[PDB]
Amino acid sequence: LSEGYVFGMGNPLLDIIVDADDFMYRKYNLKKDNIVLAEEKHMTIYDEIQKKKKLNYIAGGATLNTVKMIQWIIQKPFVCSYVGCIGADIQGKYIKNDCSALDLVTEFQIAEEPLMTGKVAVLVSRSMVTYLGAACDLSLAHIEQPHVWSLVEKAQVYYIAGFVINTCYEGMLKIAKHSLENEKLFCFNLSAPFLSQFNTKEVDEMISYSNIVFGNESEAEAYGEVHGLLEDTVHATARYIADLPFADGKKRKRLVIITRGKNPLLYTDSSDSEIHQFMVEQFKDDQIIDGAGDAFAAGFIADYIRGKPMITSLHAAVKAAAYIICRSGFSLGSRDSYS
Ligand SMILES: Nc1ncnc2c1ncn2[C@@H]1O[C@H](CO)[C@@H](O)[C@H]1O
Ligand SMILES: [Cl-]
């Protein structure tokens, strides 16, 4: 694989992990394994957890996690590229330097001060409260820059999470149109149930440019519900997404993979009339769907773009998620300790 073969664009966020008290979940009305965008009623959570001791700071972002692990798996330096918007703060410096350590080529945009780098309150006891911050300032102007668009041009594989719809939809759309036009591999993730509910137009449009669509059970149920797929919603959703017309009208295979936690994941394509089950490895009160979901995408892509068949890539996907599960959160340790 050549340098900058894989391109990613998303929201560069700093994960603030803290052992949360029981009242925290009731106080801010947080559910299990869920992600919510920080509203006004949530804003006090960031000062509240900052008083806590033993705070752990990890470079996050759905797309960034996937891309940097793909880079980590392939081992060859500078194969992956990433674009996002951080703030002019120490948090942005932490994220930037964490990418350079992994030999990840980046072209970060710096938001206008005092807009700080986005952050995610990770309350473990595991719920997430997300303040996008500077990640919102990601603009088409920064992307259309010569030294930035060069990374898009040189890439043959793209990964963009659905989260980027809230921040820079116009940017991800332009990259998607580029990918389909040049017959490249565009990989898309449903990311969160609320995206299919409140941004249905954006999701379906992105699907029309996607060669591979990632998602989980809850995202599929929300997507199928908003599309009127009532009976056998999950199975109907995978079929619906797989069979949607591509935006250029050309006939090609779109792959759809739906994770279902500890239960068998589903996969199918446009030319496949059957929806296949895939048995997944069991763990100790943990699952493939979640942090691990981003790793699942990374593990699948890292092998699939290197010629590995569907089944083999799925095992590589489970392997990648199992690695993140075995560790505390999304942190990439020694490469030789990955087998
Ligand atoms: N709105 C969001 N946009 C992009 N990434 C997010 C968002 N919310 C949570 N994440 C990231 O998702 C990961 C967990 O799957 C964490 O690294 C976290 O930073
Ligand atoms: Cl993202």
mmCIF file of C-alpha atoms and ligand atoms in Angstrom:
data_model
loop_
_atom_site.group_PDB
_atom_site.id
_atom_site.type_symbol
_atom_site.label_atom_id
_atom_site.label_comp_id
_atom_site.label_asym_id
_atom_site.label_seq_id
_atom_site.Cartn_x
_atom_site.Cartn_y
_atom_site.Cartn_z
ATOM 1 C CA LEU A 1 0.000 0.000 0.000
ATOM 2 C CA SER A 2 1.221 3.476 -0.943
ATOM 3 C CA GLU A 3 1.445 6.407 1.468
ATOM 4 C CA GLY A 4 -1.850 8.145 2.190
ATOM 5 C CA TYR A 5 -3.741 5.185 0.728
ATOM 6 C CA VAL A 6 -6.405 5.528 3.423
ATOM 7 C CA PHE A 7 -8.074 8.863 4.162
ATOM 8 C CA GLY A 8 -10.221 9.757 7.145
ATOM 9 C CA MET A 9 -12.114 12.884 8.116
ATOM 10 C CA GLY A 10 -14.016 13.454 11.333
ATOM 11 C CA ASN A 11 -14.277 15.069 14.739
ATOM 12 C CA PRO A 12 -11.008 15.102 16.717
ATOM 13 C CA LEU A 13 -12.147 14.876 20.342
ATOM 14 C CA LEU A 14 -10.450 14.407 23.706
ATOM 15 C CA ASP A 15 -11.972 11.611 25.783
ATOM 16 C CA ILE A 16 -12.128 12.421 29.491
ATOM 17 C CA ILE A 17 -12.544 9.119 31.320
ATOM 18 C CA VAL A 18 -13.648 9.075 34.957
ATOM 19 C CA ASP A 19 -15.140 6.580 37.403
ATOM 20 C CA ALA A 20 -18.571 8.136 37.835
ATOM 21 C CA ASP A 21 -20.761 8.174 40.930
ATOM 22 C CA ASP A 22 -24.287 6.749 40.844
ATOM 23 C CA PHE A 23 -25.979 10.150 41.091
ATOM 24 C CA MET A 24 -24.210 11.389 37.944
ATOM 25 C CA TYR A 25 -26.323 9.187 35.678
ATOM 26 C CA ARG A 26 -29.571 10.243 37.352
ATOM 27 C CA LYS A 27 -28.518 13.898 37.497
ATOM 28 C CA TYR A 28 -27.753 14.195 33.784
ATOM 29 C CA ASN A 29 -30.236 11.519 32.681
ATOM 30 C CA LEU A 30 -27.713 9.206 31.018
ATOM 31 C CA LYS A 31 -28.432 5.703 29.725
ATOM 32 C CA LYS A 32 -26.266 2.614 29.281
ATOM 33 C CA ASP A 33 -23.631 2.618 26.520
ATOM 34 C CA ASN A 34 -25.268 5.667 24.957
ATOM 35 C CA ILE A 35 -23.893 8.835 23.367
ATOM 36 C CA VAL A 36 -25.520 12.254 23.653
ATOM 37 C CA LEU A 37 -24.561 15.659 22.279
ATOM 38 C CA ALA A 38 -24.065 18.142 25.109
ATOM 39 C CA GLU A 39 -27.087 20.383 25.590
ATOM 40 C CA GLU A 40 -27.351 23.260 28.063
ATOM 41 C CA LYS A 41 -28.585 20.921 30.802
ATOM 42 C CA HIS A 42 -25.410 18.849 30.394
ATOM 43 C CA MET A 43 -22.816 21.642 30.459
ATOM 44 C CA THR A 44 -22.081 21.430 34.202
ATOM 45 C CA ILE A 45 -20.776 17.873 33.765
ATOM 46 C CA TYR A 46 -17.402 19.061 32.446
ATOM 47 C CA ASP A 47 -16.532 21.168 35.489
ATOM 48 C CA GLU A 48 -17.973 18.504 37.775
ATOM 49 C CA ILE A 49 -15.741 15.681 36.531
ATOM 50 C CA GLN A 50 -12.665 17.921 36.377
ATOM 51 C CA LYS A 51 -12.626 17.992 40.186
ATOM 52 C CA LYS A 52 -12.356 14.203 40.179
ATOM 53 C CA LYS A 53 -9.027 12.516 40.843
ATOM 54 C CA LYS A 54 -7.395 9.883 38.627
ATOM 55 C CA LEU A 55 -8.671 11.516 35.440
ATOM 56 C CA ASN A 56 -7.599 9.692 32.284
ATOM 57 C CA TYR A 57 -7.188 11.658 29.051
ATOM 58 C CA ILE A 58 -7.325 9.747 25.760
ATOM 59 C CA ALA A 59 -7.320 11.079 22.189
ATOM 60 C CA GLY A 60 -10.717 10.158 20.767
ATOM 61 C CA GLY A 61 -13.072 10.723 17.865
ATOM 62 C CA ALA A 62 -14.913 7.902 16.107
ATOM 63 C CA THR A 63 -13.280 8.341 12.699
ATOM 64 C CA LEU A 64 -9.861 9.105 14.181
ATOM 65 C CA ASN A 65 -9.971 5.946 16.310
ATOM 66 C CA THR A 66 -10.713 3.775 13.277
ATOM 67 C CA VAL A 67 -8.154 5.421 10.991
ATOM 68 C CA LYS A 68 -5.319 5.440 13.524
ATOM 69 C CA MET A 69 -5.871 1.759 14.301
ATOM 70 C CA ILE A 70 -5.895 0.900 10.595
ATOM 71 C CA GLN A 71 -2.530 2.654 10.467
ATOM 72 C CA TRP A 72 -1.530 0.701 13.574
ATOM 73 C CA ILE A 73 -2.544 -2.663 12.087
ATOM 74 C CA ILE A 74 -0.895 -2.188 8.676
ATOM 75 C CA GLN A 75 2.324 -1.067 10.438
ATOM 76 C CA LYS A 76 3.628 0.788 7.362
ATOM 77 C CA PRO A 77 4.068 4.492 8.241
ATOM 78 C CA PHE A 78 2.015 7.273 6.610
ATOM 79 C CA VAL A 79 -0.434 4.899 4.892
ATOM 80 C CA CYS A 80 -3.334 6.666 6.610
ATOM 81 C CA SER A 81 -4.274 10.352 6.482
ATOM 82 C CA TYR A 82 -6.612 12.267 8.786
ATOM 83 C CA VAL A 83 -8.341 15.648 8.633
ATOM 84 C CA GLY A 84 -10.225 17.350 11.454
ATOM 85 C CA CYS A 85 -10.593 20.585 13.388
ATOM 86 C CA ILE A 86 -9.057 21.128 16.820
ATOM 87 C CA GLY A 87 -8.729 24.203 19.020
ATOM 88 C CA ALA A 88 -5.705 26.350 19.838
ATOM 89 C CA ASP A 89 -5.188 24.609 23.180
ATOM 90 C CA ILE A 90 -3.141 21.928 24.941
ATOM 91 C CA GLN A 91 -5.909 19.413 24.206
ATOM 92 C CA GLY A 92 -5.443 19.934 20.477
ATOM 93 C CA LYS A 93 -1.694 19.560 20.915
ATOM 94 C CA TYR A 94 -2.227 16.247 22.704
ATOM 95 C CA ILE A 95 -4.388 14.929 19.875
ATOM 96 C CA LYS A 96 -2.029 16.209 17.162
ATOM 97 C CA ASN A 97 1.078 14.711 18.778
ATOM 98 C CA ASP A 98 -0.715 11.421 19.444
ATOM 99 C CA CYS A 99 -1.288 11.081 15.696
ATOM 100 C CA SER A 100 2.318 11.879 14.809
ATOM 101 C CA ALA A 101 3.450 9.181 17.240
ATOM 102 C CA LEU A 102 1.429 6.625 15.281
ATOM 103 C CA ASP A 103 3.012 7.858 12.034
ATOM 104 C CA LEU A 104 -0.325 9.279 10.904
ATOM 105 C CA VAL A 105 -0.238 12.103 8.354
ATOM 106 C CA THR A 106 -2.552 14.900 9.488
ATOM 107 C CA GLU A 107 -3.788 18.286 8.316
ATOM 108 C CA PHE A 108 -5.689 19.668 11.295
ATOM 109 C CA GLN A 109 -7.681 22.885 11.054
ATOM 110 C CA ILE A 110 -7.363 25.349 13.931
ATOM 111 C CA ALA A 111 -10.664 26.905 14.984
ATOM 112 C CA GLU A 112 -10.957 30.588 15.859
ATOM 113 C CA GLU A 113 -10.223 31.208 19.535
ATOM 114 C CA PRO A 114 -11.493 30.899 22.165
ATOM 115 C CA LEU A 115 -13.322 27.911 20.665
ATOM 116 C CA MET A 116 -11.661 24.991 22.444
ATOM 117 C CA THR A 117 -10.987 21.452 21.221
ATOM 118 C CA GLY A 118 -14.055 19.233 21.513
ATOM 119 C CA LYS A 119 -14.316 16.773 24.380
ATOM 120 C CA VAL A 120 -16.316 13.758 25.517
ATOM 121 C CA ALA A 121 -17.325 13.083 29.106
ATOM 122 C CA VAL A 122 -16.779 9.338 29.467
ATOM 123 C CA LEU A 123 -18.598 8.275 32.627
ATOM 124 C CA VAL A 124 -17.603 4.744 33.625
ATOM 125 C CA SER A 125 -18.771 2.627 36.561
ATOM 126 C CA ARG A 126 -20.092 3.582 30.488
ATOM 127 C CA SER A 127 -21.979 6.624 29.170
ATOM 128 C CA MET A 128 -20.783 9.450 26.900
ATOM 129 C CA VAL A 129 -21.596 13.171 26.836
ATOM 130 C CA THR A 130 -20.117 14.917 23.799
ATOM 131 C CA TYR A 131 -19.217 18.584 23.354
ATOM 132 C CA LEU A 132 -18.174 18.962 19.707
ATOM 133 C CA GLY A 133 -16.526 22.355 20.237
ATOM 134 C CA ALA A 134 -13.865 23.154 17.644
ATOM 135 C CA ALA A 135 -14.806 20.083 15.594
ATOM 136 C CA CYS A 136 -17.806 22.063 14.326
ATOM 137 C CA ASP A 137 -15.545 24.596 12.599
ATOM 138 C CA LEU A 138 -14.394 21.975 10.090
ATOM 139 C CA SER A 139 -15.119 23.706 6.791
ATOM 140 C CA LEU A 140 -15.086 23.048 3.052
ATOM 141 C CA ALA A 141 -12.574 25.875 2.613
ATOM 142 C CA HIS A 142 -9.956 24.034 4.667
ATOM 143 C CA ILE A 143 -10.597 20.836 2.715
ATOM 144 C CA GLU A 144 -10.390 22.480 -0.714
ATOM 145 C CA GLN A 145 -6.890 23.747 0.109
ATOM 146 C CA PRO A 146 -4.206 22.346 -2.249
ATOM 147 C CA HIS A 147 -2.087 20.727 0.478
ATOM 148 C CA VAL A 148 -5.218 19.296 2.115
ATOM 149 C CA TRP A 149 -7.161 18.076 -0.926
ATOM 150 C CA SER A 150 -3.949 16.363 -2.051
ATOM 151 C CA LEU A 151 -4.478 13.816 0.728
ATOM 152 C CA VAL A 152 -7.986 13.176 -0.583
ATOM 153 C CA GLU A 153 -6.701 12.782 -4.140
ATOM 154 C CA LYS A 154 -3.889 10.359 -3.287
ATOM 155 C CA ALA A 155 -6.170 8.112 -1.213
ATOM 156 C CA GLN A 156 -8.012 5.074 -2.584
ATOM 157 C CA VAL A 157 -9.971 4.213 0.560
ATOM 158 C CA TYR A 158 -12.086 6.533 2.706
ATOM 159 C CA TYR A 159 -13.604 6.188 6.163
ATOM 160 C CA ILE A 160 -16.020 8.797 7.493
ATOM 161 C CA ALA A 161 -18.268 8.250 10.513
ATOM 162 C CA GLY A 162 -21.854 9.499 10.422
ATOM 163 C CA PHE A 163 -20.968 11.888 13.255
ATOM 164 C CA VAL A 164 -19.354 14.216 10.705
ATOM 165 C CA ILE A 165 -22.831 15.058 9.406
ATOM 166 C CA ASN A 166 -23.302 17.417 12.366
ATOM 167 C CA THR A 167 -19.964 19.158 11.827
ATOM 168 C CA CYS A 168 -19.090 19.283 8.121
ATOM 169 C CA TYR A 169 -21.622 17.497 5.915
ATOM 170 C CA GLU A 170 -20.667 19.598 2.892
ATOM 171 C CA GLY A 171 -17.095 18.349 3.254
ATOM 172 C CA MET A 172 -17.833 14.642 3.629
ATOM 173 C CA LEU A 173 -20.277 14.854 0.718
ATOM 174 C CA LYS A 174 -17.620 16.300 -1.605
ATOM 175 C CA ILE A 175 -15.208 13.518 -0.668
ATOM 176 C CA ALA A 176 -17.971 10.961 -1.226
ATOM 177 C CA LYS A 177 -18.742 12.321 -4.698
ATOM 178 C CA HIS A 178 -15.018 12.197 -5.437
ATOM 179 C CA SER A 179 -14.772 8.574 -4.274
ATOM 180 C CA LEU A 180 -17.660 7.284 -6.387
ATOM 181 C CA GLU A 181 -16.484 9.285 -9.398
ATOM 182 C CA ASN A 182 -13.011 7.743 -9.162
ATOM 183 C CA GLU A 183 -14.280 4.247 -8.320
ATOM 184 C CA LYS A 184 -12.684 4.294 -4.875
ATOM 185 C CA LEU A 185 -13.720 2.534 -1.669
ATOM 186 C CA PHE A 186 -15.909 4.727 0.547
ATOM 187 C CA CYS A 187 -16.670 3.270 3.979
ATOM 188 C CA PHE A 188 -19.477 4.742 6.065
ATOM 189 C CA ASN A 189 -20.724 4.227 9.623
ATOM 190 C CA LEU A 190 -24.220 4.954 10.941
ATOM 191 C CA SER A 191 -22.444 5.987 14.166
ATOM 192 C CA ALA A 192 -25.549 6.751 16.253
ATOM 193 C CA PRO A 193 -29.341 6.168 16.187
ATOM 194 C CA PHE A 194 -30.144 9.902 16.307
ATOM 195 C CA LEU A 195 -28.408 10.467 12.962
ATOM 196 C CA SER A 196 -30.892 8.248 11.130
ATOM 197 C CA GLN A 197 -33.727 9.941 13.020
ATOM 198 C CA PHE A 198 -32.891 13.641 12.712
ATOM 199 C CA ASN A 199 -30.551 13.577 9.704
ATOM 200 C CA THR A 200 -32.242 10.908 7.576
ATOM 201 C CA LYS A 201 -31.721 12.869 4.351
ATOM 202 C CA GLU A 202 -27.982 13.146 4.988
ATOM 203 C CA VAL A 203 -27.592 9.475 5.934
ATOM 204 C CA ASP A 204 -29.407 8.085 2.887
ATOM 205 C CA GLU A 205 -27.468 10.396 0.574
ATOM 206 C CA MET A 206 -24.146 9.251 2.042
ATOM 207 C CA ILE A 207 -25.261 5.635 1.618
ATOM 208 C CA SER A 208 -25.726 6.282 -2.118
ATOM 209 C CA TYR A 209 -21.983 6.979 -2.299
ATOM 210 C CA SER A 210 -20.877 4.256 0.120
ATOM 211 C CA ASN A 211 -19.312 0.962 -0.954
ATOM 212 C CA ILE A 212 -19.268 -0.354 2.617
ATOM 213 C CA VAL A 213 -21.790 0.533 5.321
ATOM 214 C CA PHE A 214 -21.096 -0.193 8.999
ATOM 215 C CA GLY A 215 -23.735 -0.131 11.731
ATOM 216 C CA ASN A 216 -25.074 -1.783 14.869
ATOM 217 C CA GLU A 217 -28.441 -3.156 15.976
ATOM 218 C CA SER A 218 -29.752 0.022 17.630
ATOM 219 C CA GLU A 219 -28.770 2.129 14.618
ATOM 220 C CA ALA A 220 -30.465 -0.374 12.308
ATOM 221 C CA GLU A 221 -33.670 -0.378 14.354
ATOM 222 C CA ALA A 222 -33.781 3.423 14.342
ATOM 223 C CA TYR A 223 -33.042 3.553 10.613
ATOM 224 C CA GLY A 224 -35.660 0.935 9.767
ATOM 225 C CA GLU A 225 -38.242 2.636 11.966
ATOM 226 C CA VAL A 226 -37.803 5.977 10.198
ATOM 227 C CA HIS A 227 -38.045 4.155 6.855
ATOM 228 C CA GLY A 228 -41.234 2.275 7.720
ATOM 229 C CA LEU A 229 -39.470 -1.085 7.915
ATOM 230 C CA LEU A 230 -41.630 -2.465 10.729
ATOM 231 C CA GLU A 231 -41.528 -6.270 10.479
ATOM 232 C CA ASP A 232 -38.050 -7.819 10.764
ATOM 233 C CA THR A 233 -36.633 -4.297 11.012
ATOM 234 C CA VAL A 234 -32.952 -5.204 11.369
ATOM 235 C CA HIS A 235 -33.007 -7.643 8.445
ATOM 236 C CA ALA A 236 -35.150 -5.246 6.414
ATOM 237 C CA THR A 237 -32.747 -2.395 7.155
ATOM 238 C CA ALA A 238 -29.679 -4.287 5.926
ATOM 239 C CA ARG A 239 -31.534 -5.232 2.738
ATOM 240 C CA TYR A 240 -32.775 -1.664 2.253
ATOM 241 C CA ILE A 241 -29.338 -0.096 2.707
ATOM 242 C CA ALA A 242 -27.717 -2.695 0.444
ATOM 243 C CA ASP A 243 -30.255 -2.206 -2.341
ATOM 244 C CA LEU A 244 -30.358 1.601 -2.452
ATOM 245 C CA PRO A 245 -29.379 3.043 -5.848
ATOM 246 C CA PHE A 246 -25.858 4.449 -6.121
ATOM 247 C CA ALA A 247 -25.840 8.181 -6.873
ATOM 248 C CA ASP A 248 -24.246 7.743 -10.314
ATOM 249 C CA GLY A 249 -26.630 4.973 -11.347
ATOM 250 C CA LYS A 250 -23.891 2.432 -12.027
ATOM 251 C CA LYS A 251 -24.483 -1.109 -10.780
ATOM 252 C CA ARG A 252 -22.010 -2.145 -8.080
ATOM 253 C CA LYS A 253 -21.872 -4.130 -4.837
ATOM 254 C CA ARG A 254 -22.473 -2.219 -1.626
ATOM 255 C CA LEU A 255 -21.502 -4.198 1.461
ATOM 256 C CA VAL A 256 -23.603 -3.824 4.609
ATOM 257 C CA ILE A 257 -22.413 -5.082 7.994
ATOM 258 C CA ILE A 258 -24.634 -4.893 11.082
ATOM 259 C CA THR A 259 -23.103 -5.787 14.454
ATOM 260 C CA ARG A 260 -25.407 -7.207 17.134
ATOM 261 C CA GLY A 261 -23.285 -7.279 20.282
ATOM 262 C CA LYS A 262 -22.525 -10.774 21.547
ATOM 263 C CA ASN A 263 -25.041 -12.093 19.021
ATOM 264 C CA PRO A 264 -24.061 -12.994 15.420
ATOM 265 C CA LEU A 265 -23.433 -9.993 13.187
ATOM 266 C CA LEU A 266 -25.275 -9.663 9.884
ATOM 267 C CA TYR A 267 -23.758 -9.044 6.459
ATOM 268 C CA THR A 268 -25.074 -8.839 2.898
ATOM 269 C CA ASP A 269 -24.666 -7.013 -0.412
ATOM 270 C CA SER A 270 -26.607 -5.654 -3.394
ATOM 271 C CA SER A 271 -26.151 -8.834 -5.434
ATOM 272 C CA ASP A 272 -26.913 -11.132 -2.498
ATOM 273 C CA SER A 273 -30.510 -12.173 -1.833
ATOM 274 C CA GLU A 274 -29.554 -13.709 1.513
ATOM 275 C CA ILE A 275 -28.556 -12.077 4.790
ATOM 276 C CA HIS A 276 -25.810 -14.100 6.445
ATOM 277 C CA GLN A 277 -25.086 -14.590 10.142
ATOM 278 C CA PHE A 278 -21.546 -14.511 11.516
ATOM 279 C CA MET A 279 -20.799 -16.039 14.919
ATOM 280 C CA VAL A 280 -18.799 -13.678 17.142
ATOM 281 C CA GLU A 281 -16.316 -14.356 19.954
ATOM 282 C CA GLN A 282 -17.642 -14.130 23.522
ATOM 283 C CA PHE A 283 -16.086 -12.023 26.294
ATOM 284 C CA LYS A 284 -16.517 -11.153 29.978
ATOM 285 C CA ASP A 285 -19.486 -8.744 30.073
ATOM 286 C CA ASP A 286 -18.190 -6.976 26.948
ATOM 287 C CA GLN A 287 -19.286 -6.896 23.304
ATOM 288 C CA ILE A 288 -18.130 -6.065 19.768
ATOM 289 C CA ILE A 289 -20.573 -3.155 19.386
ATOM 290 C CA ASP A 290 -18.895 -0.787 21.866
ATOM 291 C CA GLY A 291 -15.001 1.940 21.270
ATOM 292 C CA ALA A 292 -14.841 -1.638 19.997
ATOM 293 C CA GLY A 293 -17.175 -0.732 17.142
ATOM 294 C CA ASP A 294 -14.581 1.667 15.761
ATOM 295 C CA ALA A 295 -11.972 -1.074 16.072
ATOM 296 C CA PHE A 296 -14.279 -3.518 14.297
ATOM 297 C CA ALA A 297 -14.391 -1.192 11.289
ATOM 298 C CA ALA A 298 -10.620 -0.704 11.443
ATOM 299 C CA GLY A 299 -9.905 -4.433 11.617
ATOM 300 C CA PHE A 300 -12.210 -5.183 8.709
ATOM 301 C CA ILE A 301 -10.847 -2.405 6.497
ATOM 302 C CA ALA A 302 -7.149 -3.033 7.219
ATOM 303 C CA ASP A 303 -7.471 -6.574 5.847
ATOM 304 C CA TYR A 304 -10.136 -6.062 3.175
ATOM 305 C CA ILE A 305 -8.115 -3.399 1.351
ATOM 306 C CA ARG A 306 -5.141 -5.770 1.359
ATOM 307 C CA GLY A 307 -6.935 -8.446 -0.658
ATOM 308 C CA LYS A 308 -8.323 -10.540 2.204
ATOM 309 C CA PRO A 309 -11.746 -12.104 1.514
ATOM 310 C CA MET A 310 -14.991 -11.204 3.313
ATOM 311 C CA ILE A 311 -14.955 -13.925 5.988
ATOM 312 C CA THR A 312 -11.257 -13.421 6.745
ATOM 313 C CA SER A 313 -11.741 -9.667 7.108
ATOM 314 C CA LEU A 314 -14.654 -10.245 9.500
ATOM 315 C CA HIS A 315 -12.391 -12.324 11.751
ATOM 316 C CA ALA A 316 -9.794 -9.559 11.561
ATOM 317 C CA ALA A 317 -12.593 -7.181 12.512
ATOM 318 C CA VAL A 318 -13.551 -9.233 15.576
ATOM 319 C CA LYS A 319 -9.868 -9.615 16.460
ATOM 320 C CA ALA A 320 -9.397 -5.836 16.393
ATOM 321 C CA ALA A 321 -12.432 -5.239 18.606
ATOM 322 C CA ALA A 322 -11.350 -8.016 20.980
ATOM 323 C CA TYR A 323 -8.018 -6.229 21.402
ATOM 324 C CA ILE A 324 -9.664 -2.951 22.417
ATOM 325 C CA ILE A 325 -12.020 -4.866 24.717
ATOM 326 C CA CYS A 326 -9.086 -6.607 26.414
ATOM 327 C CA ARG A 327 -7.554 -3.190 27.103
ATOM 328 C CA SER A 328 -8.936 -0.212 29.017
ATOM 329 C CA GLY A 329 -10.821 1.886 26.480
ATOM 330 C CA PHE A 330 -9.364 2.693 23.066
ATOM 331 C CA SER A 331 -5.590 2.607 23.525
ATOM 332 C CA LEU A 332 -3.068 1.028 21.164
ATOM 333 C CA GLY A 333 -0.147 -0.613 22.954
ATOM 334 C CA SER A 334 2.771 -2.626 21.593
ATOM 335 C CA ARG A 335 2.139 -3.762 18.020
ATOM 336 C CA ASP A 336 3.922 -7.093 18.520
ATOM 337 C CA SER A 337 1.504 -7.830 21.363
ATOM 338 C CA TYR A 338 -1.421 -8.121 18.950
ATOM 339 C CA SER A 339 -0.685 -11.522 17.380
HETATM 340 N N1 LIG B 1 -20.358 13.271 18.248
HETATM 341 C C1 LIG B 1 -19.166 12.530 18.052
HETATM 342 N N2 LIG B 1 -18.433 12.700 16.927
HETATM 343 C C2 LIG B 1 -17.275 11.993 16.709
HETATM 344 N N3 LIG B 1 -16.824 11.105 17.615
HETATM 345 C C3 LIG B 1 -17.522 10.882 18.791
HETATM 346 C C4 LIG B 1 -18.711 11.586 19.041
HETATM 347 N N4 LIG B 1 -19.181 11.164 20.271
HETATM 348 C C5 LIG B 1 -18.318 10.237 20.762
HETATM 349 N N5 LIG B 1 -17.302 10.055 19.865
HETATM 350 C C6 LIG B 1 -16.162 9.147 20.012
HETATM 351 O O1 LIG B 1 -16.628 7.829 19.897
HETATM 352 C C7 LIG B 1 -15.683 6.949 20.543
HETATM 353 C C8 LIG B 1 -16.429 5.787 21.151
HETATM 354 O O2 LIG B 1 -16.986 4.946 20.147
HETATM 355 C C9 LIG B 1 -14.887 7.814 21.531
HETATM 356 O O3 LIG B 1 -13.512 7.836 21.148
HETATM 357 C C10 LIG B 1 -15.491 9.219 21.378
HETATM 358 O O4 LIG B 1 -14.551 10.273 21.437
HETATM 359 CL CL CL B 2 -15.772 11.382 13.726
#
